[PDB]
Design a binder for this molecule. Structure first.
Ligand SMILES: CC(=O)SCCNC(=O)CCNC(=O)[C@H](O)C(C)(C)COP(=O)(O)OP(=O)(O)OC[C@H]1O[C@@H](n2cnc3c(N)ncnc32)[C@H](O)[C@@H]1OP(=O)(O)O
Ligand SMILES: CC(=O)SCCNC(=O)CCNC(=O)[C@H](O)C(C)(C)COP(=O)(O)OP(=O)(O)OC[C@H]1O[C@@H](n2cnc3c(N)ncnc32)[C@H](O)[C@@H]1OP(=O)(O)O
Lengths: 263, 268
């Protein structure tokens, strides 16, 4: 591993094209960077250096565990436990609820001085900087990753997306394209969301779009090459991709309508 | 019980088990927790924080070590040691301790969750901070000085002053920080001092301050622990979920610890 510092990461982010004063949605891997002097704290500081005082950093802070136990599959739980879990699950707390599968950087980021987290109990985002409150305000149940969500806010704020040591499999912005596009064979289903109600949760059944993630690599690579101003490069030891979210999401809508046809 | 023989443990079950162990409502409580020891916690670390907040109540105070031992000189790193060439770079480029940003190391999921709770506050020592929540939180974390990082003018001293209790939740006397308060207070036979480098925050950089400190001796923790505990009036042993738990009065125990070291420690 290469010894990588706060200053080196910040300079490499500027070399990739991270706009001072811009809104930046970050999908980060800590272990891909090399050996980070100061670890996840050094990564967060370098990202704040890159965007500057007038910039904004946004990161997914998903808490997938706050979901019906019948859906659980990494460690599935006994069926006899399901009703106790449903009644006793603590409600989402933006300060207390940890992230799952988001990475050490977002988990370190969410608590930063000035960082604010959105209200969705499963798909919240944390933001820091000039437009942080706007990014996280009124995150609705209707389209958790679409209209009235922080993904829509990054779009309206003409932000960039940084894939830092991870690829299109972590590209949340494709979900914004999925909600906006009536592509052939688009499906819906009913989901259970635990909505906070004091010290308890109130399970609310809601309809939602069924996401499709199999073509993320083919769609990403095709949309990325057609996104004007995009860049590829190395930040530390990590392979990185930087792109304008607006142009890219609009191309993803065009890709889904032309190339998706579900069984 | 699941495939892995773990039993379902809930926030309400943990708070009641804590009340049954003897956790006092309105009291100051210093916690040393293991999440895996508890069983399968419904809501994980967040459910342990909430159950501990329920046990002490609104008038109570929770305190936990939030140590960030990586903020030390690279020459001392052993678990993951780094090339000697990197040491001057590491010394120059290490970010300063930030109470909001710096993660804990070796503290566990519960402390890591706790430190960010609404109303929790964290002390200023770059290696040995504590986080506190509740009625006397600000008092507990306020005076964190360099002279005795785990002694006079440290959150361990505030727990003592406020007549707090100590909870060892699924871990034992190897995690008992209160022993360090006794170590500073007692001139036991072979007590040593050494010099240590502490990175002090200086804006965006660290300033490496060499300071004198007491050398901690930890090999007798279990022997001293069992001896002081059995003589601590009103202590309790019990079960919190699946975890073996110990609850004791910090003032009486720390005082017994000082007497134990004077009588049984003789360092060469
Ligand atoms: C359907 C959808 O698309 S939405 C989901 C959106 N997802 C995201 O935004 C997540 C974006 N991030 C990713 O995708 C990533 O690839 C991840 C987090 C899932 C995987 O990345 P990893 O690098 O494997 O994990 P992470 O970033 O948590 O790093 C911790 C690892 O770094 C290492 N590490 C620890 N300290 C340091 C340091 N100073 N320097 C370098 N590495 C370190 C350790 O190897 C650690 O592993 P351990 O904690 O098991 O010992
Ligand atoms: C010199 C001195 O005396 S001062 C030092 C004082 N130290 C302290 O106060 C720390 C107090 N804690 C301890 O001593 C503990 O024994 C520790 C933290 C060192 C080890 O405890 P562990 O239970 O092994 O770890 P921790 O509490 O972080 O729990 C995480 C483990 O819980 C498990 N886990 C995760 N979710 C759940 C859940 N819902 N339910 C139950 N277990 C879970 C996983 O195994 C996890 O480990 P992973 O992150 O590898 O997946």
């Amino acid at each position: 591993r290469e010894l990588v510092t706060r200053d080196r990461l910040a300079s490499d982010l500027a070399a990739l094209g991270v706009r001072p004063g811009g809104v930046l949605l970050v999908h980060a891997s800590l272990s891909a960077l090399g050996w980070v002097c100061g670890g996840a704290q050094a990564v967060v500081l370098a990202l704040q250096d890159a965007v500057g005082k007038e910039g904004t950093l946004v990161m997914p802070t998903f808490s997938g565990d706050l979901s019906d136990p019948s859906t659980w599959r990494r460690p599935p739980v006994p069926e006899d436990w399901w009703p106790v879990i449903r009644e006793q699950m603590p409600p989402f707390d933006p300060d207390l609820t940890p992230t799952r599968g988001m990475g050490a950087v977002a988990e370190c980021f969410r608590r930063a001085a000035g960082a604010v987290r959105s209200g969705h109990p499963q798909n919240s985002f944390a933001a820091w900087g000039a437009h942080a409150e706007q990014v996280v305000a009124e995150h609705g149940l209707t389209e958790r990753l679409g209209r009235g969500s922080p993904l829509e806010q990054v779009y309206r704020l003409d932000g960039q997306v940084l894939l830092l040591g991870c690829g299109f499999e972590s590209n949340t912005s494709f979900h914004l394209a999925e909600y906006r596009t009536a592509y052939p064979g688009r499906r819906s289903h009913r989901r259970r969301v635990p909505v906070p109600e004091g010290d308890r949760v109130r399970w609310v059944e809601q309809e939602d779009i069924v996401y499709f993630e199999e073509d993320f690599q083919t769609m990403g690579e095709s949309c990325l090459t057609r996104t004007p101003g995009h860049s590829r490069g190395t930040v530390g030891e990590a392979a990185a991709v930087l792109y304008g979210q607006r142009a890219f999401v609009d191309l993803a809508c065009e890709w889904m309508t032309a190339h998706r046809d579900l069984a």
